Amino acid sequence: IWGCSGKLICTTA
């Protein structure tokens, strides 16, 4: 149970 650099990176351009 993670949001992350590890689970799935937060794509924000």
The residue type found at 5 is: S
C-alpha–C-alpha distance, residues 10 and 2, integer Å: 12
Which alpha helices (H) appear in the chain, and where do they start and end?
A: none
C-alpha–C-alpha distance, residues 12 and 2, integer Å: 18
HSE of 12 in the Cβ direction (CA atoms, 13 Å)?
3
C-alpha–C-alpha distance, residues 1 and 13, integer Å: 25
C-alpha–C-alpha distance, residues 6 and 1, integer Å: 11
Listed in order, strand segments (DSSP E) in 1-13 are none
C-alpha–C-alpha distance, residues 13 and 11, integer Å: 7
Distance between the two ends of the chain, CA-based, in angstroms?
25
Burial of 4: CB neighbours in 10 Å, binned 0-12, 13-18, 19+? exposed
